[PDB]
């Protein structure tokens, strides 16, 4: 029984017998845990027209959908084509690596 991140990574890679249902439940937990205010800091630090801006805004929208309608957002994730779900999860795992911390905080200067 892996944790949230391990379950999601397993689903992306089609290993450890993780089902789409378990992945979407775990994804909902990850979206709850992620701090959307910190993602907005990352987004605002991008140069304008950076393709990352759209990614950050997608994860931000999914956090808001998950916060309003938890179980419907899980169903929405289950309805997504597998390849679209996996891209959304991968982007969300990437943001998790960038913002998880015990904090107020700033954004790094390197590029």
Residue numbers in the entry: 73 to 175, 178 to 185
Sentences from the study reporting this entry:
The M2–1 transcription antiterminator factor is a basic protein of 194 amino acids that exists as a stable tetramer in solution and is essential for the complete sequential transcription of mRNAs in HRSV. It harbours four distinct regions: an N-terminal zinc-binding domain (ZBD; residues 7–25), an α-helical tetramer­ization domain (TD; residues 32–49), an RNA-binding core domain (RBD; residues 69–172) and a C-terminal unstructured region (residues 173–194). A crystal structure of the tetrameric M2–1 assembly and an NMR structure of the monomeric M2–1 RBD have been determined. M2–1 oligomerization is primarily driven by a central tetramerization α-helix and is also stabilized by contacts between the zinc-binding domain and the core of an adjacent monomer. Given the relevance and uniqueness of this viral transcription antiterminator, we set out to investigate its RNA-binding domain (residues 73–194) using X-ray crystallography and folding thermodynamics.
The HRSV M2–1 RBD crystallized with two molecules in the asymmetric unit. The structures from both crystal forms are virtually identical in the core region (residues 58–177), with a root-mean-square deviation (r.m.s.d. on Cα atoms) of 0.3 Å. In the tetrameric HRSV M2–1 crystal structure this region was disordered and thus not visible. The C-terminal tail observed in our P3221 model could be extended in solution and would therefore explain the lack of globularity in our SAXS model. Electron density for this region has not been observed in previous crystal structures. On the other hand, the crystal structures presented here strongly suggest that the carboxy-terminal region of the protein would be unstructured in the closed conformation present in the RNA-free tetramer and folds upon the helical cleft corresponding to the ZBD-binding region in the RBD.
